């Protein structure tokens, strides 16, 4: 049983199919998991995401740079960044953002649409919880969505360090074909469903160890259809079991090497180190961010 | 000479029977930690709960200035351990209580330096 894992990752064989997109109909659609006393869904969800990310070959440099989009809640706090900050090595630079105002444990927070966010540096890990409930129009064709997904795709291509990783929230209706295609630019990728929210079509699209070029060609419409087919035919038993064992929670500080190489220096040898979670390619200057403000 | 006193207004609102500030961010943790008051990662012992610090700061939560010249927050970006019996109101707890500068424990909730 997978009830003791933090969640379920999409099996590779489902990734290789060519299904057509149909409506997502989850067996366990009605149910909820029993959370430990006083624990919020979004703390439990981010805890399980981080527990699963502990099993991947994440690059963990000194001066890890992490940015978290969609980090506010409708009560004005940031439960996800509180978990990320618990997970990440002490001293990790953590930047926060959301459309609406909130108070945060991140080292810096920007308020506004994500498209107004600019950074000088590159990043080692990008986390996104952004989601628009207005996409859940069951009465119409589920097409690839734009909006913040357009920003995220460009932000990965321009500001993710080689070797870095990504976890971007999707749902049945909140998804983007280019983001799936971008998954083929990592050494490995999956769609991960937390056990605590398994009654939802939510998944985190995870790109592990960015390579900056297409390692494989992924049609994003087909892959989202494959993702739904997997969810439709593989009910996941809701479970909070993994939340009760936090003894191994913190991200291992691997001291991954950072180097500044340009493009012509990235061999198959470098690509191989990137692929194994053993190298980060970016500058290690000061981290500078800003938010664009429109005046009247 | 005027200055709003949110700490007093919250204490007085608590005394008059008002519901505490909610949605403080409680963390999952082992509950085998050092039990110290304000730490860089959750450190609750068996008798404590650990919360994300910013969510437990009255000034952070009310969007008002922090009462010191450099308007610095000693909770934001850290974790605060709250005795389980008081975890229904972490904001009030951090307001009313003091951290021993030698123990790192809460005075009267773990500090044993005065024995
Ligand atoms: N373009 C963008 N730029 C920057 N931040 C962005 C952008 N888009 C979205 N966000 C941010 O992502 C966070 C997660 S969405 C939370 C949610 C979930 C559900 C869900 O699960 O049913 C539902 C809602 C919801 C429910 C009723 C009315 C309503 O109006 C919304 C909200 C969030 O704080 C939001 O501000
Ligand atoms: Zn504060
Ligand atoms: Zn003491």
Curated annotation (Swiss-Prot), chain A:
Instruction: Provide the catalytic activity annotation.
Output: a 5'-end (N(7)-methyl 5'-triphosphoguanosine)-ribonucleoside in mRNA + S-adenosyl-L-methionine = a 5'-end (N(7)-methyl 5'-triphosphoguanosine)-(2'-O-methyl-ribonucleoside) in mRNA + S-adenosyl-L-homocysteine + H(+)
| Residues at the catalytic site | 45, 129, 169, 202
LRR repeat placement? 18-42
Q: List the subcellular locations.
A: Host nucleus; Host cytoplasm
Domain Nidovirus-type SAM-dependent 2'-O-MTase span(s) in chain numbering: 1-295
**Highest rank taxon of the organism:** Viruses
> Its quaternary structure?
Interacts with nsp10.
Q: What does this protein do?
A: Methyltransferase that mediates mRNA cap 2'-O-ribose methylation to the 5'-cap structure of viral mRNAs. N7-methyl guanosine cap is a prerequisite for binding of nsp16. Therefore, it plays an essential role in cap methylation of viral mRNAs, which is essential to evade the immune system, especially when restricted by human IFIT1 and IFIT3. May disrupt host mRNA splicing in nucleus by interacting with pre-mRNA Recognition Domains of the U1 and U2 snRNAs.
Q: What is this protein called?
A: 2'-O-methyltransferase nsp16
Organism the protein comes from: Severe acute respiratory syndrome coronavirus 2 (2019-nCoV)
Give the residues of the full protein shown: 6800 to 7095 of 7096
Curated annotation (Swiss-Prot), chain B:
Give every ExoN/MTase coactivator domain span.
1-115
Residues that coordinate or bind Zn(2+) 8:
100, 103, 111, 113
Q: Where does Zn(2+) 7 bind?
A: 57, 60, 66, 73
- Compartments reported by the entry: Host cytoplasm, Host perinuclear region; Host cytoplasm; Host endoplasmic reticulum
What's this chain's function? Plays a pivotal role in viral transcription by stimulating both nsp14 3'-5' exoribonuclease and nsp16 2'-O-methyltransferase activities. Therefore plays an essential role in viral mRNAs cap methylation.
What does the record note on quaternary structure?
Answer: Forms a dodecamer and interacts with nsp14 and nsp16; these interactions enhance nsp14 and nsp16 enzymatic activities.
| Entry protein name | Non-structural protein 10
Source organism of the structure:
Severe acute respiratory syndrome coronavirus 2 (2019-nCoV)
């Amino acid at each position: 049983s997978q009830a003791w894992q933090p969640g379920v990752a999409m099996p590779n064989l489902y990734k290789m199919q060519r299904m057509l997109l149909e409506k997502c109909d989850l067996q366990n659609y009605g149910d909820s998991a029993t959370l430990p006393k006083g624990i919020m869904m979004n703390v439990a969800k981010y805890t399980q995401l981080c527990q699963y990310l502990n099993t991947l070959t994440l690059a963990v440099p000194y001066n890890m740079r992490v940015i978290h989009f969609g980090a506010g809640s409708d009560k004005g706090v940031a439960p996800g960044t509180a978990v990320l900050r618990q997970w990440l090595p002490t001293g990790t630079l953590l930047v926060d953002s959301d459309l609406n105002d909130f108070v945060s444990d991140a080292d810096s927070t920007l308020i506004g649409d994500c498209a107004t966010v600019h950074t000088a540096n590159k990043w080692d890990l990008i986390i996104s919880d952004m989601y628009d409930p207005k996409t859940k129009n069951v009465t119409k064709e589920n097409d690839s969505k734009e909006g913040f997904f357009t920003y995220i795709c460009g932000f990965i291509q321009q500001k993710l360090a080689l070797g870095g990783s990504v976890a971007i929230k999707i749902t049945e209706h909140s998804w983007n074909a280019d983001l799936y295609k971008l998954m083929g630019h990592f050494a490995w990728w999956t769609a991960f469903v937390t056990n605590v929210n398994a009654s939802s079509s939510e998944a985190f699209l995870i790109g592990c160890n960015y390579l900056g070029k297409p390692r494989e060609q992924i049609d994003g419409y087909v892959m989202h259809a494959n993702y739904i087919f997997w969810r439709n035919t593989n009910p996941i038993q809701l479970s909070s079991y993994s939340l009760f064992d936090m003894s191994k929670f913190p991200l291992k500080l691997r001291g991954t090497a950072v180097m500044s190489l340009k493009e012509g220096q990235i061999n198959d040898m470098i690509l191989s180190l990137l692929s194994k979670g053993r190298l980060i390619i970016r500058e290690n200057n000061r981290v500078v961010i800003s938010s664009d403000v429109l005046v009247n | 000479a005027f200055a709003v006193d949110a700490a007093k207004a919250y204490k007085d609102y608590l005394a008059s029977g008002g519901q505490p500030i909610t949605n403080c961010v409680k963390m999952l943790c082992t509950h085998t930690g050092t039990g110290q008051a304000i730490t860089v990662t959750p450190e609750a012992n068996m008798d404590q709960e650990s919360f994300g610090g910013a969510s437990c700061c009255l000034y952070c939560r009310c969007h008002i200035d922090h009462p010191n010249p450099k308007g610095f927050c000693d909770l934001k970006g850290k974790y605060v351990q709250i005795p389980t019996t008081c975890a229904n109101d972490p904001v009030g707890f951090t307001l009313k209580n003091t951290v021993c500068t030698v123990c790192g424990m809460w005075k009267g909730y773990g500090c044993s330096c005065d024995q």
